[PDB]
Write a protein that binds this ligand. Sequence first.
Ligand SMILES: [Zn+2]
Length: 46
Amino acid sequence: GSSGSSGSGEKPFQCEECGKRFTQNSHLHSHQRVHTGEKPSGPSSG
Ligand SMILES: [Zn+2]
């Protein structure tokens, strides 16, 4: 139940589904491919 995906790292560019860490953004944006599927055509609330 406790927090699962800890979003407390060093690098500024951190994922949202895995809160990973990366040096550049390109790596992150593209890295999001590992989470393919969820295609929200609209904005998110929380
Ligand atoms: Zn990720």
